[model samples]
Target chain A: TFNETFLKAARGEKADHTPVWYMRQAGRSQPEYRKLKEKYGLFEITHQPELCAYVTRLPVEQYGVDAAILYKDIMTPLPSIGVDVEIKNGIGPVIDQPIRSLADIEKLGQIDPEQDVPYVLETIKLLVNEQLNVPLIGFSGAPFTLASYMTEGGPSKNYNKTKAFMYSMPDAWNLLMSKLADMIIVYVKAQIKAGAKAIQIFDSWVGALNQADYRTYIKPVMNRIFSELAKENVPLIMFGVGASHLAGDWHDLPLDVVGLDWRLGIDEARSKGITKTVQGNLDPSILLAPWEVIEQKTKEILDQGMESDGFIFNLGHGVFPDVSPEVLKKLTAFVHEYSQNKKM
Target chain B: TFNETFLKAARGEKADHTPVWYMRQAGRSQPEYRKLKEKYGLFEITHQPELCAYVTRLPVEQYGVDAAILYKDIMTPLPSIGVDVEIKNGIGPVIDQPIRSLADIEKLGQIDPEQDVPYVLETIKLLVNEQLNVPLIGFSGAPFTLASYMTEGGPSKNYNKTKAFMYSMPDAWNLLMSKLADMIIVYVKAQIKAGAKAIQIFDSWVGALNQADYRTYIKPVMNRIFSELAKENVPLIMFGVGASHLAGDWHDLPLDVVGLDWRLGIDEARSKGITKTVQGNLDPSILLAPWEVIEQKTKEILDQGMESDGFIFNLGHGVFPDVSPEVLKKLTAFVHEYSQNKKM
Candidate 1:
């Protein structure tokens, strides 16, 4: 049967069991994905719809996870907007000409999804319409996170250049934020039009900002992006690593679900007055632990999640390449077995 | 006269101003330090008492910070305990033989601070007894954090190998933790006896554990370390980078102060019942921001901090190499200027 459990939990509705999925679930940790990576880079597989569809559905087939997140990097769409980014194997994205001044922002092109990234839309269609029983999530990097790479020109331990640019050149930063927001709205709307059941906006590093900075700089554009996507009538999730302080602010946005990393727990978020449906936040590193420890932590997370009507089980962040598919498979089974009888 | 403002604030007493310091303050951002680095590695500097003393006192002379934290890597003491660790310049500490089994734990030797690390104690004597007027903070890597590098063999993004060892091999993990704990106690006690005014335990990565995992695996050892140090009568500060969730647990320990990262604010920490004297938490990236934004955020942090009697101003983390020394100088002056009139 086609599973609506993920969709149900995402919309603050009751589900028979807490639905499960993982960020970066589609690849990296899997044996098949590694074999494919020996021949192709991340962009290479993502550019081929048939190959991408197989990668996307592998986790669902292997783990019985209730959802399939589209297999692609957040840097996937940067090329469409005239950003020169290469996905380095061990390091993260490397940008050739990083954004610095207003001139850099002005030089950027817009994303025409069907024209520039038909493969992405095509992969969504393959999963939602033809291949999978589970919902497929389409994702984009939030403006600040994408801009962090674009400004710094690579992975950074601290987004100093990025935040410096944002602080020193407000006019340029605002233009950059709005432009990226426009690109996201168009690209995500295209994904929804094609067949993505939900969209997760990965603001992976925006936790680098405080509440005041977030509200002053990044939140307005996020507010605009989610408000525009809210009209599409599909679920939207907001996620970031180490950004637990922004949970209340993310909850204030017009989104369906808030994704958490393991740093914050469901009970804590609930105590802080986050009424939105919540997805996520088992620490993915815990997957490396013994089964007894994994099971104990998973049951604790599930109990916290099942306290309310709206919760979906997921890792706080993406899966590391060292994680075993067998452990993930066992974890998925435990969630299913444990939550079935205990669902509120 | 000695600057006792930091010591006063750390002990939860009233001070003339909210005393200021930056983690990683001494060497990385200074041009002189960089030039010196062209001549020596971190270990070479620490091995020379005169050179390490100069490095330690440079920040106090330049920024007028209330305290001079000993200028050394947390990996400094590991070699004394027979752990083969090399402080790789940019990549961080890399271990030659990572802990994997009970045998590895059993094979580890104990630290004799006077016999093994006399240079460290000599540097402390040079600083506290002769070099400067400010209090000198002696420090050691907390058991869990040091064990992370020892077990994983280097800097880790997820600490999967470290946590896996903890979970899958509890006996080995516990032994490793206790040995690291014992090393810290002996080493830190030596620093205190050698004229170090206070101590800061850098548990930089312990924030990776949830509260449950922390209480179960780490807190007992930490408790033992801090309780033993409490008898030294000098102030003890506990710090970790992403461990804001463990603030309550840290406060529950017998330590005199808690260090916060940028993710949790002073007001938030206070409201959550962290009554211990608090140190820290301006985002170090904010140093790259323009003067106005920096001043605004600084004022806000000051206002939040001044709500109580026991607050010390510090960057949430360390000052990065890219940060201009001029800004830190300006910031140190501003913290002194702003908090002078507002003290409770």
Candidate 2:
């Protein structure tokens, strides 16, 4: 099965062909899923375990991808941490109470695995139990990214407030990061216990800091998170966008795979000693181009990706809502067919 | 003098103290400059050669900067090329005609050096002839970046249209780039004739392309621009944002200085065999922080920048609108003071 191939590839071992999956493969890109979304709202589908499993498997059934990342947001674990955050439709997450000081961090709620997110666990359990053949990947926001959202109140362009806190008050920054790291460890571990075969940490905002500041403020927490998860025996993948600076640093961690954004090529990344499995790097906007362009670009990425063992073909970022599902399906078949021939 | 120091540093020769300047050093940040803008307006001041020279010299006269980059927009040449473009006050440039195809490209009027953009030459001449004793740096948008604005019709988040043009119509793309390269060579040579001691080519959008595509498509255009300007014996600086991927590629070119964005450390860039003079890389946001944080960050960048002989202390990107001119003046002094102490 594709999941077996992906698992083998993740271990730096050979597989039948390069396993392919797109980031956000199942979400807004699917037309059938859009109809479902029209019928049932986002919150409704997420809250219902059966619907979540069904939606999670839709991409695998349609696109024939190698794995199914559990359908959820990184902020799903935040409510348990006493941060009143909710994903608002057009505007994104809104945190009613943001942690501003040490007192707020001290008062933050502890995440209990069995008590806090039973729905998430139950959804994964259902997907693992009856719904899926491919491996299920669980993920959580790395502390710094999560802390950025918590502190900034929403998505930011410059991340000024976050950097202010990081530079102005180191002790408070550390306190917030420590708590967020603990929460991530708990959240990721809980998913592992439930049914996640592998874990990926998404530090989406880490690109905001330079190497020195990143190493100083975020690396310790990253090390702690990965070191704790290393014992679980499941592969750990870490990725951040616009973060080519962190590629070498990410490799220094215990991660089994490094997720690449569109910024750097796979061959160049490997040369930088990113010896672990590499996933990603197509520009999502390319899918909007003509089919011939898509095939040609896909082939180019596959050719470069062949230089490394354990490569997963994926968009550098998430798929856009406007890309057609037929195009994605055609692209997937192209990758699978082309990669199989290369194997021979 | 800062001008002599800068010229010496640019040649990989010894300088009395490390020369420092800021991109966008004179505009938006200074209270006097802002008051002038409120009094006259960006377009009026920009069009008037005397006002442009006044604005250009303010940083050197007031903040004691090492160099003065000419006060003109990259799109200043657009009018000569038959594209009706204007720089609005709060909003950026508004282009009436954007090149979409060969027809659109053909529609663009031939750029006559003397007929069109006389003000550009006039402004540079005023700054060099009448302004204080600092090296006057002339600049133009690199072909790829200028083409991006033309192809995308304006600012873009993904640059999909530009990439499609790049990937789909190879011939048209090459033709456009060839024209742009010729224009840049002509424009830069004009500024040199007008007494600009150095020239900088800002390829702000080339960073979006992968290294392979860049090497194939963009690098040759850059090489041509630099090669054409090489006969004049003037230092040419090429700077792009998030262009760490192209680090080693520009080393053997005819260019004298390779400007870095904040995305890369100077030492790491030097290790990649980019052994020429390097300018840049302080995160502009640091100035908004408290003085201690600013000092620490500045000290760190200065330390990292010390390994190279012809290092120029400047912001990794442009100076922010909110950054105080006082902070920049202090930073320039600090870098000079600190680097001098280290030399001793």
Candidate 3:
């Protein structure tokens, strides 16, 4: 199966060719997606399990990508954990009462998966049974990152409030992380039970902390989350933005795949002893460039990725909203064709 | 002399104690500076050589730092090159006519140092003669960084215009860089002639380019600039934010010191064969933390820096506006005293 091949490749095992997919491969750059949004609306399609499954598989059928990640936001798990959150259209996720004090932290309890996110399980079940030829990868927000959004109430520039909380109230920070980690474990376990062949933890904000703070505050939570999920025997991947600094630190975890942003080269990461299977890091900005430039840049990233046994070709970050899906399809086919020829 | 210690340290030679200085050591963080600002105002102080010298010496006398960077902006050289620039109070530099085409590049002339920036030369001379026991370091924006602000009209996040020019009109990009490189050469030469002990080129935006783009479009211009300035016999340092990828690439440049941002550690840089002197990498955000947090963070950075002989303790980026000046004073003294005792 393509899913098995992807899992094998992620574990540094030989595969027929490099498995190619993107971080946000499903929506927002797809012409079909724009049309779907006009017809059914994003929230409507996401709420219906059958519609969600169909939308998730559109990229696999259309672009022939190697794997299909489940189409859901990380904040999907937030509402399940008793956080009053809703995905606002132009304005992203809007939380009702952001966790700003100890009282708010105390209010967040262990997320009960069945009560909170039955739609997620139903969506996964539908995709696993009827939608995917490739693996359906499950994912959740890493503790530190989720806590950052929950604490600050929205997107931040310097993450000053979050850092202040970490420095001023270390014990409170730890308590928040511990609860958040438990929520992740429960949320991910439910997805695995419903048939997620692989998992990825998105630590989008972990790059904000330096080496020492990362180790002291974040590493233990990450270790606990990954360790709890280890019994599932499925591949685990970790990705963070602006996080080349955390590349060396990720080796300390039990993750099978390490995702990279475009900030550092794959060879550079490998030199730092990132011996695991690596996925990533073409700059998403290239999608805005002309096709010739895109092809040349993609080929260069592909050439560097060939040095390792288990390599998955993908963008360094998620696709931008305005990118044309046709270009992405052409680029995907190019990566597949070029990489297969290199194998021979 | 202080210049000899700085020079020796730049070559990775043994030094009496680790030389320490902040990037904007003489800027607005000090309370004394606020008083001076109330008395004379920012532009007036910057324009007058004696006032500039007085403010520059205040930090040295108070904190006892080993190096005093000359008080001037990179845009000071723009008028000499016919770019019509001014440093607005909080808005940074505002250019009347941002470069748009080959015509704009053609119109820019060589910078006449004596005509445009005599005040800068006079100020450096005064600081060198009157300041007590430290080297007077001179600096200018590297060709690409200055060209970024020049072409974009001010500080920009995407640098879309700059990248578009590089992609659309490669010839114009090269021509613009060549002109800017010549301006840097002339500016630094004037400072060297005026008793500026060393030079550092601030490539503040070089990290915006990927490795391939950097090599093709940016490296040659930097190489030329450094090579032309090498005859001065004064040490040169190159620094850019988020530029850890370029550490290995700078080994062969005509420079003696490599400044690192907070994103990279000294040992990581050393592993890449960056044996030259290293300055920086303390996160400026730590200044907002409590004193204990600041001290602990400072100690960790200093211990890591101890692995190399020519480590100059400084912030990874400029000091923030809101940081308490008393904390900075205490931190500076702590770094100097701790490193000195560690040496003993």
Candidate 4:
């Protein structure tokens, strides 16, 4: 049967069961994907619409998740903006030329999605139109996160270079922020136009900053990005890892749902007065526990989530490489069965 | 003159100013320390009492910080218990033989700190008796954090292996935790006996778990550790990075002070009724910002910290390598002068 449950729940409405998905659900753990990786680079896979669509839909078929997020790197759009970024092994996205000044910011070009990333739009269209019954989620890395990579030159444990660049070069930082903001706006809307039913903005590492820095440096651009994206008339989800302090700030943004990492519980976030539809937060590491322990942790999170109408079940973060597909499948079934029975 | 303000603040008493120090203040960023690193490995430097004393006292001399934390790796005591750990460059504390089962943990030996980490106690004795005027803070890696390194075999992005071992083999996990907890008690008490005035339990990575998991798997050991350590009559501090959600749980512990990383604010923690003394949490990255910006950020933290009687100024985490010594020196002066003037 077709499932609109994910879409329904994202709009603060009731669903048949707590709508479920996993961040990076289609990522590293699958055996079939492992074989594909041996043969193809990440960009090589993303460049082929059928292969990307296949990877995107694997979790949907295997785990019975209610949504299929397009399997692509957040750096997918950077090449179009004249940024030289690489998806490297073990290290993650690395920028060949990092932005340092206003001149570097000015060097960035606006993304024209139709010409620049036809494969991405093609992948989204393939998934939503003919391939799947569940909602197809379109996503982009948020400006601050992308800027983190672009400025730091690679993945950072602490964004010292990025923060230093921002504080030391305020005008350049603002210009860079605005440019990335504009890039994300265009990049995301093209995904919507190509049939992405929902959108999520992964501001993964922005949690490193406190509320004041977030407000002074990040919120305005995020406000503009989310506000402009809000006009697209689809569910917009704002998520960042370890950013529970900013959950209240996220709720203040013009978005429909705020995603939480395991550091904050669904009930706790709600009790603190966040009224928006909330997605996520079982600790992904819990998947490595015994099935009984996994079941117990999932049930606890499910029970907290089911207390409210607008809740979606998800791991607090991505599935680790060691997490088994069988476990995810079992977890998905448990989420459906448990939440459904509880509702009855 | 000696400054006991750090010790006073840790006991929930008023200080002349919000007493300041930094985690890893004696670390890599200082040119003197950098020069020493060129000649010796981390273990080599710690092996020499006079050199370790110089490193510990250097931060106090340079920054005018009210306290001197003994300059040693958390892994310093591991070798005594037969853990083959390396302080590898870029990749932190790597354990050559990782514990996998009860047998592996059973083979572990307890630390005899006086016999085992004599260099550490010697360093503390040297700092307090002859070298430094500041209260010497002795620290140990909290059992959970040390167990994280040992179980995972090295540093982990997510503690999947550690948590799995915890959930699947509860008996073995408890054994490891208890053993580590005992080792820490002996080691810290030895340092105290050797003239260290205060203690900090660095549970740096334990923030990865939630309150329920924390209470279940970790709190028991932590409670036991703190309760046992309370007999020493020194101020005990519990500090962890990114563990703001555990602030309430930590407040319930028998420790004298709760150390927050930058993720949580002192005002926010205090407002939530954490009446225990609180230490830390200026984001260390802020040190790289311009002086005006640095002064503004420092003053903001100072105002918040001064609102209460028991507050210690510190970086939310360790000083990053790129942070300037001059910036830290200037900021320490600002923390003292601003808080001193504001006290009037």
Candidate 5:
């Protein structure tokens, strides 16, 4: 139960203190991570279980963050399913052939994690066996996010092709979502079986929709995904940027927590009847500020978080590559120390 | 009082119908507009008073949209102040000399819109004097948005340099804001005097800040600018892409209309105490959907907008260039006809 604080808070249970972590905390922002990067490509590091384990644990040790998210891209499982994609340096995931029709969906093979993603399971086993002092979170891009990348062929601002495909080709859209949901359920369950303490489904691109469109187009698929993952009995967190309005839709699904970006107020989120525990809401870029500014900004969200029963301190988004590792350590320590004192 | 529905709703009065328009209706989507674009570059069109006015009015004739926003970039006012910028064909406004320090802010000249931006004034006069049926709206970038472009030196995804400048250089941030705010007030006031029926402040990137940073860095300047404009007695509409949570911050300003992106619900915005009036919020990309889907989506928001004393039917953000003009023209007609009957 040592790392139970994050799990407890996420599950809406009382905790010793509010838990804390940063998205991308275990990667990019750490010097150890960069050294590993210099020695190997991202894929090479991920393929080698020990390197992945070391990269995963480095931040929990250095920053003393409350959770250690497994070090893997959301696309980690995609290639296993025969989707041709590459995480291009600096540019992000670039799919050689984008998803557009039923044919593309048919081309995507289902993943057998044991056969195709043995390294992923191996890294998760390593983290769990060593007993990460904090919880180790397992995450994957939610269906919409994965679908956006697949359809648009890469990172996109417009999401036009994806929407056009969905709006025009309902049968194909549902087929793609169904196939992805099937894979994601199996994939997430495998991570849990191997040892992820909690699960976060990142629907990062779903904010591109309005309330009606989200309800009509997205909510059903999400419910199915979360419901299928429910038997694993792990806490599920749902998140997207620019999506505070969709919190209600997420709440309708079976999820343990909703992640808040800096754009949404924790109070506003709670007022929306997001009764489950919530995570996040510090602006990550603030870490670049002077210590005092970072401290002041952190304390404000901390005060807001502690005002409610269950809250986890986290950045609105991921940590940037340029963020100082020392700054992260200091901020993580501050959240831990500050919340610990308040809890008592 | 003819064609006063949008202005009335923008002024917080109940109207017979929810007045509707698309943000970039005057550009991109229209075949006529594309023909014009083929003939001249974007800036060249804005530089010509007759051309700009024609582009602004073309969409209205086609779609019967309730208002015509002047077709210009937020950076249109910057060049007058010695900022070297170019509106590249596909890439958008690129500033060759980006703003950074107090010295850069100090070196900039202020705008005498009549003297510096005669074309902008001329367009407004043409729309007004020619008795275009709908209101001719004028706009300028909010301080933070303008500053982002100025500091980043171009269109950016990260806004890293912009945020860094604000976080690290407080004195320079304030100075930059002051100068920009001073310029925008004069610029927008000039448009109003030249016969723009209402004003909108495009803070397209202000949502990039968290609550604390927004209040400390951006809000006061917005308050300053809008407060000054309060003397003009023109309806001021404030908006950003992912900025629904900041609706409360806008409520604290003197503006009458807080524009809602599709990412927010009208109910949610109203509950945030954004009571003056609300505009926008259909996901513009949804226009690509089938006619039935578009109709269903439109009716949902139209019902929501009609629930209150003040609501304007518009897309959450600007209409995308890829959007079908026929879809928009039909949607506008639907809103008008649907709301017209409903009011009875």
Candidate 6:
């Protein structure tokens, strides 16, 4: 039970202390993360299973977190599925031939994670077996999010093309979502088999939809995705950044946890009837603020987060690259220490 | 009452029909608007009062909307107040020397809008005299919105620098907001004096805050800004795109109407206790949809919007550049005739 706090909280059980971690806790803000980046392309690091495992394990040992999320891009499994994508330096993942029409969707090859993405499973196996006793979170982009990148071809501000595709071409959209959902199920199941303790589905950009649109266009696909993955017996978390409005829509889904961006209070999440264990609500920008501001906001989020029996502290989004690692670790220290005292 | 539907609706009075107008109704989608763009630079047109007035009035006659919003950039008045900003062709307004410190805040000049932005007053005066029979909306960027541009120095995806400045430097932040609040007061009052019918505060990006931060950082400046304008006896509407969470926070602020982006339902806003006139709730992307899709959504929004006498029809956000002018005109006509038929 010592290193199982994250898994326990994620599973909606009482833990000895409230678990705390930051989004991107393993990446750029840490000097070690940047140093590793200097030597390898992001995918190169992922391809080398031993290095990927080291990167995954280094974060928990360095920051003293309750979980280790596998260190890799969400696009890691795409190439194996015949979707061509490259992680550009600052621009994010760019697809070479963006998905369009029935032909494009039909062209996407199915993923068999054990055979197609063995390195990812190998990395998870190494982390679960030797990277401390804490749980390892295995994640994949949700059907809608993966579809956004696949259709839009890159990071987008408006996602106009993505939504237009979804709106005008229902058949194509259905096929794309269905295909991505299947891929995610296989990818996540492989991690569980290899030793991941929990599953997180990153619907990070799906917040653009209103409740009606979300329920009508997205929820069914998400329902299908979560239903298929529910058999894995690992806690699954549903998260999107600007999606506080969609929280209630997620209530009936089979997922065990709903993640919060800082835009919504933990109390609001409860009022909206998200009964599952909840993680996050911190604004990552606070990491750049003076300590007093950071301390104050962190305490406020902590108080709100601790109101639930199942809570995990995390940033609303990822840590900005320029944010100080010291400030991040400092807040981590404070949350871990403070939450313990209050419970005692 | 001929030019008064928009004004009456804003005042929370029963209207003959729900007044409808698209934001950016006067700009890019129309070929006439693009012709002007070809001939003149953005702010260059602002300097020519007649040209600005023509751009403002062209849409009402062209589209049969109930109101004409004055055509100009939100950054139109910044340069007159000693802030150096340019409206870039594709990128939006970019400020060369963004305000970062108390000294930078102190250097912002006071605007005697009658003198400094006389061209704006001249344009409003022209619209009042001969731009046919419709209300002309005079508007300014809300203090927080203006401060965001000033602090971040441009259009931002994350607004990290702006939020960072606000969180780290409260004293300087206060001064910056204080100056913007005052500028907005003077600028808007001048438009009112020059025969503008109603005022809109474009806090377009205020959706960036959660309720707590909106209360702490943004609400105070907005409260002061709206409170001063409340005495003017004109309906003052407050709007931001992703600010559905903050709509309930606007309940106590002294404004006549709260604008609802498509993300928040009219019924949802009403449930949250926004008892004033509501000006919007339609997704603009629907303009690009098939007529049936547009008709179905328009009727749905109209049904919800017509639940109260204090409803007005408009797009959830500004019109997209690629949206068809004919499509906009069709939607406008549909809303006008449809609302009347329902009422009769």
Best by DockQ: 4
B307 in model 2: Cα distance from truth in Å?
3.9
In model 6 chain B, where is the ten-residue run with the lowest total lDDT?
B85-94
Candidate 5 whole-model C-alpha lDDT, 0 to 1: 0.83
Off by over 4 Å in 5: A1-5, A12-18, A86-89, A106-108, A130-133, A307-309, B12-18, B87-90, B271-273
Candidate 5's residue-wise lDDT over B1-344, tens digit each?
A: 46898888887787787798888888777778888888896668877888888888888888888898888867788888888876564677677867756788889789988888888888889888885888988899888988888888756775877887898899989988998988999999899999988998898988887677789898888889988999999888888887866778888888988888877788767665667788988877778888998898788888878887689989888887788888888898999999999987
Better of 3 and 6 by lDDT: 6
- lDDT scores of the candidates, listed in order: 0.88, 0.83, 0.81, 0.88, 0.83, 0.83
Cα shift from native, residue A170, model 5 (Å): 3.5
lDDT of 4 by residue, A174-257 (tens): 999999988999999999999998999999999889888899899999999999999999999988888888999899999999
User: Per-residue lDDT tens digits of candidate 3, residues A128-244?
Assistant: 876677898899989888888887787675676788778877888988998888889999999999989999888888887777679988899889998889889898999987778
Which runs of model 1 end up more than 4 angstroms from their true locations? A87-90, B87-93, B341-344
List, residue by residue over B267-337, the lDDT tens digit for candidate 2: 88877777899998887767777899999888887897777668988888888677887888888889889
Residue-level lDDT tens digits of model 2 in A79-195: 897898765675556787666787988888789978988888999999887778899999998888888888888657667678877888889889888888889889999999999
Q: State residue B122's C-alpha deviation in candidate 2, in Å.
A: 2.5
The parts of candidate 4 lying over 4 Å away from their true place are A87-93, B87-90
TM-score of 5: 0.92
Tens digits of per-residue lDDT for model 5, A67-154: 8888887887888778887756765557888886688788777989899889999899988977577788998898888988888885
User: In each prediction, how many residue pairs overlap at the backbone (N, C-alpha, C within less than 3 A)?
Assistant: 0, 0, 0, 0, 0, 0
Candidate 1 lDDT by residue in tens digits, A1-344: 89999999998887898899988877778889988877786667978998999999999999999999888878877888888866455686678877767988998889999889899888888888899999988888899998898988866876888888988999999999998998999999999999999999999889888887899999999999999999999999999998887999999999999999997899988998998899988988888887898999889899999988789999988898888889999999999999996753
What does candidate 3's lDDT look like per residue over B225-323, in tens digits?
888898888889988877777776776688888888877788878886888788888888778778899899889889988887878888888875677
Judged by DockQ cut-offs, is candidate 1 incorrect, acceptable, medium or high?
Answer: medium
- In order, the candidates keep a fraction of the true contacts of 0.78, 0.43, 0.22, 0.80, 0.61, 0.49
